[PDB]
Amino acid sequence: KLEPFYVERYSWSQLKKLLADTRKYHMAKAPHDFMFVKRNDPDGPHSDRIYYLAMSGENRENTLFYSEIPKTINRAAVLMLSWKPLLDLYSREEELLRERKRIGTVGIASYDYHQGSGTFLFQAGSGIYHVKDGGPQGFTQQPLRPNLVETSCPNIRMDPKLCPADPDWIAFIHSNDIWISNIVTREERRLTYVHNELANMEEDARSAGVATFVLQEEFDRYSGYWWCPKAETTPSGGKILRILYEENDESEVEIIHVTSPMLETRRADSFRYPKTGTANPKVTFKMSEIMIDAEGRIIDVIDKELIQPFEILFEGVEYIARAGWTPEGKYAWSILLDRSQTRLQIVLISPELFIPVEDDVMERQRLIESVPDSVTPLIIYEETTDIWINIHDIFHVFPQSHEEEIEFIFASECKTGFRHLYKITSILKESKYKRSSGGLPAPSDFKCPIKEEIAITSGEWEVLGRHGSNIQVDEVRRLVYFEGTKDSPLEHHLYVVSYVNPGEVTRLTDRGYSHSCCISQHCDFFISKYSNQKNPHCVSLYKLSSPEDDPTCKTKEFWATILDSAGPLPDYTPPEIFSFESTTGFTLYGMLYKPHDLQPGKKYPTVLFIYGGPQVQLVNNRFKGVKYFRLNTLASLGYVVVVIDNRGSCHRGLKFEGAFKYKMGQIEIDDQVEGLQYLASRYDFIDLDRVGIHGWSYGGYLSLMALMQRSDIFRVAIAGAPVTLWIFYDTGYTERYMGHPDQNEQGYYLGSVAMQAEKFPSEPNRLLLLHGFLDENVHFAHTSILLSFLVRAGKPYDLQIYPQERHSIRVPESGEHYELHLLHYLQENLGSRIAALKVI
Amino acid sequence: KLEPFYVERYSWSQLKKLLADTRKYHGYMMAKAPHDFMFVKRNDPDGPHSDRIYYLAMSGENRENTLFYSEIPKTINRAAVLMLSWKPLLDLLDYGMYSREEELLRERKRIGTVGIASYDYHQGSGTFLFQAGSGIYHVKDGGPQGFTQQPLRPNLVETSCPNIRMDPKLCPADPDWIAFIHSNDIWISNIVTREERRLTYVHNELANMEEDARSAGVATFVLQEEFDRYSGYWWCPKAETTPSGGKILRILYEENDESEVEIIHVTSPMLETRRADSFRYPKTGTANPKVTFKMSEIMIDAEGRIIDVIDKELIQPFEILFEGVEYIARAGWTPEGKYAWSILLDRSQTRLQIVLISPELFIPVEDDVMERQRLIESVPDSVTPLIIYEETTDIWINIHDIFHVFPQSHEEEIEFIFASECKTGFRHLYKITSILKESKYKRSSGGLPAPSDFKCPIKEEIAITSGEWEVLGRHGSNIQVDEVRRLVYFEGTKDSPLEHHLYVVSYVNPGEVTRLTDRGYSHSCCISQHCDFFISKYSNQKNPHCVSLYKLSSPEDDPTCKTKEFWATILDSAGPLPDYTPPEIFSFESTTGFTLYGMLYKPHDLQPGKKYPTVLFIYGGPQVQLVNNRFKGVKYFRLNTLASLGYVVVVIDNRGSCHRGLKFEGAFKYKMGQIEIDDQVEGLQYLASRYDFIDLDRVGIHGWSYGGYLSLMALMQRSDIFRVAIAGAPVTLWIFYDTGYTERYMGHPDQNEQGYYLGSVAMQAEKFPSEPNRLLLLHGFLDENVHFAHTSILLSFLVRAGKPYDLQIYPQERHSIRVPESGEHYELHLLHYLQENLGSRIAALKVI
Ligand SMILES: *C(#N)[C]1[C][C](F)[C]N1C(=O)[C]([N])[C]1[C][C][C][C][C]1
Numbered sequence A: 001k002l003e004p005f006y007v008e009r010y011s012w013s014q015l016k017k018l019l020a021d022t023r024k025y026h027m028a029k030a031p032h033d034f035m036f037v038k039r040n041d042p043d044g045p046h047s048d049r050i051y052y053l054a055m056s057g058e059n060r061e062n063t064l065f066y067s068e069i070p071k072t073i074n075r076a077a078v079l080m081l082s083w084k085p086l087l088d089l090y091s092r093e094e095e096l097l098r099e100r101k102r103i104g105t106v107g108i109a110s111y112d113y114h115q116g117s118g119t120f121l122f123q124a125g126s127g128i129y130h131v132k133d134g135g136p137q138g139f140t141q142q143p144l145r146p147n148l149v150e151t152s153c154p155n156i157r158m159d160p161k162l163c164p165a166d167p168d169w170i171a172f173i174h175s176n177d178i179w180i181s182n183i184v185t186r187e188e189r190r191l192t193y194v195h196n197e198l199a200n201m202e203e204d205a206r207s208a209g210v211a212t213f214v215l216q217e218e219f220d221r222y223s224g225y226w227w228c229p230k231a232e233t234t235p236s237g238g239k240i241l242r243i244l245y246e247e248n249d250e251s252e253v254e255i256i257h258v259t260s261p262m263l264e265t266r267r268a269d270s271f272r273y274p275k276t277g278t279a280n281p282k283v284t285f286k287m288s289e290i291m292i293d294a295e296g297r298i299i300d301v302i303d304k305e306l307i308q309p310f311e312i313l314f315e316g317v318e319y320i321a322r323a324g325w326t327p328e329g330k331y332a333w334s335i336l337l338d339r340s341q342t343r344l345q346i347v348l349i350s351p352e353l354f355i356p357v358e359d360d361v362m363e364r365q366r367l368i369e370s371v372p373d374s375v376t377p378l379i380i381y382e383e384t385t386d387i388w389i390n391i392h393d394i395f396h397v398f399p400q401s402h403e404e405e406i407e408f409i410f411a412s413e414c415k416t417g418f419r420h421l422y423k424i425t426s427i428l429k430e431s432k433y434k435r436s437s438g439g440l441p442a443p444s445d446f447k448c449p450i451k452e453e454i455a456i457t458s459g460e461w462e463v464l465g466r467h468g469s470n471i472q473v474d475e476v477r478r479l480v481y482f483e484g485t486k487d488s489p490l491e492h493h494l495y496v497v498s499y500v501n502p503g504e505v506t507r508l509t510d511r512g513y514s515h516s517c518c519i520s521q522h523c524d525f526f527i528s529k530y531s532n533q534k535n536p537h538c539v540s541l542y543k544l545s546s547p548e549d550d551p552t553c554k555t556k557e558f559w560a561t562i563l564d565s566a567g568p569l570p571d572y573t574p575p576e577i578f579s580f581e582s583t584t585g586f587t588l589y590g591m592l593y594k595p596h597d598l599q600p601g602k603k604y605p606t607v608l609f610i611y612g613g614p615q616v617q618l619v620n621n622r623f624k625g626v627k628y629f630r631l632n633t634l635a636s637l638g639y640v641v642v643v644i645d646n647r648g649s650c651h652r653g654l655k656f657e658g659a660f661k662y663k664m665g666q667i668e669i670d671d672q673v674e675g676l677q678y679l680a681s682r683y684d685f686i687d688l689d690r691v692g693i694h695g696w697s698y699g700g701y702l703s704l705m706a707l708m709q710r711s712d713i714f715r716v717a718i719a720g721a722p723v724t725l726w727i728f729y730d731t732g733y734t735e736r737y738m739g740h741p742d743q744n745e746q747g748y749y750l751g752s753v754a755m756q757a758e759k760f761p762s763e764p765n766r767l768l769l770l771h772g773f774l775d776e777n778v779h780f781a782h783t784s785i786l787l788s789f790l791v792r793a794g795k796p797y798d799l800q801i802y803p804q805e806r807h808s809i810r811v812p813e814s815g816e817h818y819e820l821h822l823l824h825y826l827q828e829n830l831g832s833r834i835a836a837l838k839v840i
Numbered sequence B: 001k002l003e004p005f006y007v008e009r010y011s012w013s014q015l016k017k018l019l020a021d022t023r024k025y026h027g028y029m030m031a032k033a034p035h036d037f038m039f040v041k042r043n044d045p046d047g048p049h050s051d052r053i054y055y056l057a058m059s060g061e062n063r064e065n066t067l068f069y070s071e072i073p074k075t076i077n078r079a080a081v082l083m084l085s086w087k088p089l090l091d092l093l094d095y096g097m098y099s100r101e102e103e104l105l106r107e108r109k110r111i112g113t114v115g116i117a118s119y120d121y122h123q124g125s126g127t128f129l130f131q132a133g134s135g136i137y138h139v140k141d142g143g144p145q146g147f148t149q150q151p152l153r154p155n156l157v158e159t160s161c162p163n164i165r166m167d168p169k170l171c172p173a174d175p176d177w178i179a180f181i182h183s184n185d186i187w188i189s190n191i192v193t194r195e196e197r198r199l200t201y202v203h204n205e206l207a208n209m210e211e212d213a214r215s216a217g218v219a220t221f222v223l224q225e226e227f228d229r230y231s232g233y234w235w236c237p238k239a240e241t242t243p244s245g246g247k248i249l250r251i252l253y254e255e256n257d258e259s260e261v262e263i264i265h266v267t268s269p270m271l272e273t274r275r276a277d278s279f280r281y282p283k284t285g286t287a288n289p290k291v292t293f294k295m296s297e298i299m300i301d302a303e304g305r306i307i308d309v310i311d312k313e314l315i316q317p318f319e320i321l322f323e324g325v326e327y328i329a330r331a332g333w334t335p336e337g338k339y340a341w342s343i344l345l346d347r348s349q350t351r352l353q354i355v356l357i358s359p360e361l362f363i364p365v366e367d368d369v370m371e372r373q374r375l376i377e378s379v380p381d382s383v384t385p386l387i388i389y390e391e392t393t394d395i396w397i398n399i400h401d402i403f404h405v406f407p408q409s410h411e412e413e414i415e416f417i418f419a420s421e422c423k424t425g426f427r428h429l430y431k432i433t434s435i436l437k438e439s440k441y442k443r444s445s446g447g448l449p450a451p452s453d454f455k456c457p458i459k460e461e462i463a464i465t466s467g468e469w470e471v472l473g474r475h476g477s478n479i480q481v482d483e484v485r486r487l488v489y490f491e492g493t494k495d496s497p498l499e500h501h502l503y504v505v506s507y508v509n510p511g512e513v514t515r516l517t518d519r520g521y522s523h524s525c526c527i528s529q530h531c532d533f534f535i536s537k538y539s540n541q542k543n544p545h546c547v548s549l550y551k552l553s554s555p556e557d558d559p560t561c562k563t564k565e566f567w568a569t570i571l572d573s574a575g576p577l578p579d580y581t582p583p584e585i586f587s588f589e590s591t592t593g594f595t596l597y598g599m600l601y602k603p604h605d606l607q608p609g610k611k612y613p614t615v616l617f618i619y620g621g622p623q624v625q626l627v628n629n630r631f632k633g634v635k636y637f638r639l640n641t642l643a644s645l646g647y648v649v650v651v652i653d654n655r656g657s658c659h660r661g662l663k664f665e666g667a668f669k670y671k672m673g674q675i676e677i678d679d680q681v682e683g684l685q686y687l688a689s690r691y692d693f694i695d696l697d698r699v700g701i702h703g704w705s706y707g708g709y710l711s712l713m714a715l716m717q718r719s720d721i722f723r724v725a726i727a728g729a730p731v732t733l734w735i736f737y738d739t740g741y742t743e744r745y746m747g748h749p750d751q752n753e754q755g756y757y758l759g760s761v762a763m764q765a766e767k768f769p770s771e772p773n774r775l776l777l778l779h780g781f782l783d784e785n786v787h788f789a790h791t792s793i794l795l796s797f798l799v800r801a802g803k804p805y806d807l808q809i810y811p812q813e814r815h816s817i818r819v820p821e822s823g824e825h826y827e828l829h830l831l832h833y834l835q836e837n838l839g840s841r842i843a844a845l846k847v848i
């Protein structure tokens, strides 16, 4: 055998300096939310102005910038675009939204724009502001002082949107009701009256226009209202504007208490948290109909409800996943899920389906009878799966050729097990169901027949539709731009394909990098944010053209750099990606960080960093030197570091993901250990007697499962924010992967760490629990209940709390302490001479 | 030099077994000794017994606390020792299954007993009343109905009330009637007729505590936690007759309004709920409850039926009649029921008043304004409150239970015995006679009274006791007064600050104090109401607690001269425990001018020429003395366990601790945390010069609550001396602690910014070590007394400052540790931490 390498035993103070010195040379948002606006100046040198959000440097606010795209370039040179700033200068609601969106940025997080006017609308903290650039008014050559939208509202205004039909009007949320405001006339008007700010949340559980917790946390829907994009003209010379909105009633949702951040207060905030197996909010759709006169004064506002209840019209629907309008405004649409998340429906909802709210019963009947039986909801698409529906942002509706026909592109994993693009044409027929007759509809009564369903894409690879990945459709050339894994599961690339006669898929991005892309609305440019394992993130602009002979065919030319990378970082060596053929039948991928200054004939302690849950892939060809820089730091101290994407992880198709359905915690460690054993047979420097594991959230969960199941392999486990009882986690996530608890008694038992506390070791210095005290996602109770049972069972543990932190670690001091304590714990209980010496 | 002794390095499992094996022999010891004694005469000239004694006790380990009796014989064989048989009074009621109100009360009272916690008795009827779990029960023994020779069936007081009934009291004027609290209101119930009636309507069970903060008849949190007042209502001991052949019964009660008191949230025990309970917690410098007195007047007909109930309020508001009073500390009635009395404190707790409150001072509650004036003018101006005693101090008033009122000789004069530290700086008994004059203040005239207007002149104030020693008046210690012989029996520290003893002295012509208990033991005593017997529960460092009965006589020539004879054993001790060596009590002359006492547990099998790791166990706060001549082998058994492993164990009562007088106690006024460790170290250094076996490089410190606080202060202030600190339930910010305790010792925070800063660990987090394996924090997660926030805020600052810490939480525990598994884990973790970071070879080896 080989002699063990012991890591150098630094003091706490020494380690603190070491970590400080290595952070001080080495967190600043790359450009995002791009939009392209044509200059339309035939004598001028620029084709387009691009607008984007970004941070200028470290410790600077996220704001709007523009850059000028020239008509031509010098192809001998590389053009660096100047960032010209567009502008010249937290509530509980903001804090929580930032937690749900996972945003560490200070300042402007998003913006709205209206092409025809050039009006930008954005929140910046307390205020809602607007400015004009790039419509009729023209293009600024310097930063603009914005205009504050006046209000009489006492509380934070959230979720501002411009009316696409009239950019004088905005909507927003205030104290969970919808308001509108005219930015020229200054008229302000409340539309919904479902919440009372003055009441306790315990008595007042209604809201309008907001996505509730599970929707923000588990489906990435943050808005609950949608402007109709067109205005209906009136005989008076006026108009009608429309807002579709979700109305929620959380009355029957369980109330939990989370410690208030103001620890001095010794108080706790109420949250509506739908735990697994308990009531989700009672949802419905409503519509606000807003009549405006000839000079922009409101005449009247009519609040309208569905002609029959949501539960009757949309049998079995638990969640409104997505909603919007068709481009013409003829129909509202929605993507709807059942509770088990195995049936998706895409449904068109005519405005004629809504009637005035009328508590008077004689008049209500008059209003019900006035709506014809022919007006029904139209299920244009329905799919099922034995695994789960993964919601995405891809849904493109074409202009209507015929009143009785709708054409759209959607994406789905349900046919083949990989997400692909499909062009569907559905028939809008009169339903067999007639309200008149006084019955209830059978489930199939609103289903439309499918005329055609053609696959645009196919194969053993996915189209991406989350995290800003979407499609862009060119209706002139009849093409669709999308991102996908076709070339490699370790790289994202941009592709184009014909939707009309689908065939050759053309890759637009270069191999050897993973890419995150944005296509211009005009379909003549795209941007790629790209990196690889060796090289930090860059952002570049590419011009799209087609040959004279064939408008279908697309080519790419480099145009300009928006963001140059820092070169390779000097105090950072990347990991090697490896793979192994698993006994499970899949190729699994991993990353190996070898120890630095690797002495021959010595074997080194090993740390397995792990996530291992759904919706995430760790192993790919992206730069890891920012986010996973401390994995490199561990390697520099003489730990082997390993990361493995087990089954259940992302970007391998639905079957791969589906491996842990009903069985969370039961399979992931088998893969981790298999990878570990693959490495150890190939590399004698891995000391399998000194293996540690660490992860956060799902990673914390698995770190516990590893110690509990495989104490023969894992010497120490360091579990951050672990799920320890799946019954405490929420409906949307838990039930998706694990079903209802009654239908999976053994899965809930075996997958819940805290039900199995007897299986922990009776040796100390092996288990370390870390948790943000104020975590409203994974409640501290996961940790406290575990400890309750550990104590009852006579087992040792170590604990660290981050009393000012939620799920994330936001305050830098908290992160410095976490990093320091982690390295020190590993030093003392895994890597050093003293660690091996204290083993009993 | 000397060689360092390293403790044996046990594994966690090994240590667990070791701790289990050493507890298994000493599982008999968790069992309540007889208490709440009462003597009833047999009055049987042919019978062999003079008295029957009744008391609460446990039969043994894992049995409920219940009522027993024993028979006191007229004569004894003095050649023998009589063991009294424990005859059970009841035919057994209480499981462990408590409401929130019961749980909280038990936390406030510090009671670990299951069963009957207390009882009431009515001499004239023989009626016992007691709560046993959910139920309120009665039996009869010792009245006209006679004396049972067999156990009695407890009789359930039936009810229509949905919720737990609390604080049951017999009406001393009519033992057919009881009162209790239900959902923070007063009810009464007749145990013969079964008539039940609500008296007060201030609380609504159906509302949220956030909207409904009124309560009647109950002591609020601060009173229960910081003044040991659990009740807020007092039956008038006599009934006023009506012309109809009926009667009027009366209850004085405190009515509280907690509307302005801050609401905190404490984690609900049901952790699966992920919820938190609301508590009214008056933090330092914020509002205490709005308090007043009220009176319920209950008219009963000739055959026991309620005719009417009239709720009555003070003729003018509490704030006017009792200028400057913050706390009602105590209350009750004069023996005849002519006056209610109260002991009243100002906010700063530097002014005590004893006030008499006539029933005529209350008028019917009346919303109608025309009728209210009629009622106000109908009360004469001559009827005012009577402040019969007022005292002040530059330190603090320590509330006690001593207050005895003699029968009234003259309508304009009242005679009483009270106890005070205010004259001499030690608590002593004073016989006072106050003049009840008509006040200068006249309501008619429509003004407000000046502060002095209700002060009664003092006719006489004679000291019954004096000296450099205290009379004891808390924790069950009280006086017994013999009005026939004109004597007062009391407990005190005259013979030694390490022993409590029973004393008697004349109140009429006070001189020589006679010690009745034997030297070499500390005593806790109960005197018979008849003053011809007493009981002592007594122990010392070498011997577990005994309970013995002693007969009192005087020679025919001199009733002042009291003698004692042993009569019988009630409880014999277990002998000395076999796997236990007690500590030595030591003392040293401090540079501070005081003698300070300590306990030293030497290591077992002490090898010569070795020096040993040392653990200082500490409390060090007010109201407590650790070092005295009592058996410590139950409560502090694990100190002996540590000694057995090879730790030296040290305990020292620093300045601020109890039983040394007010000046000693007052050493830390405004200055908490600043003095206590200097005394601890001085003692430690005294011992180390005297005993070369103490390794001063390897000293640890550990305590709970104030002890946790000081353990942190020790590491902060004296990291040169203390290698590790283990702090349980520490106060880390005095601003988070309550009004009643904190303001007493530290004043209001606005007037003592420097005191609060220097006394608050969490404001000084930078002063902790930058070395790990030195600080360990322990806390009950559900603690509603010392909130977990003390720990979480400390960690907030430790994290901000980059300092390491270790932490253990007890998720099922409040301030106390009640679940045995929690205690097993605490003990295990403590010994293992000490082993790994203080005592062992590996500990020294990991020091960098
Ligand atoms: C962590 N991770 C927690 C506990 C459980 F593992 C899931 N989880 C989450 O934060 C989820 N709500 C996230 C949904 C988006 C994909 C990452 C996990």
Ligand SMILES: *C(#N)[C]1[C][C](F)[C]N1C(=O)[C]([N])[C]1[C][C][C][C][C]1
Residues within 6 Å of the ligand: B225, B226, B621, B622, B623, B624, B704, B705, B706, B707, B709, B731, B741, B785, B786
């Ligand atoms: C502990 N001990 C806590 C914190 C502070 F030190 C005082 N304290 C208490 O529990 C007090 N409420 C007790 C009052 C009665 C005598 C012991 C202390």
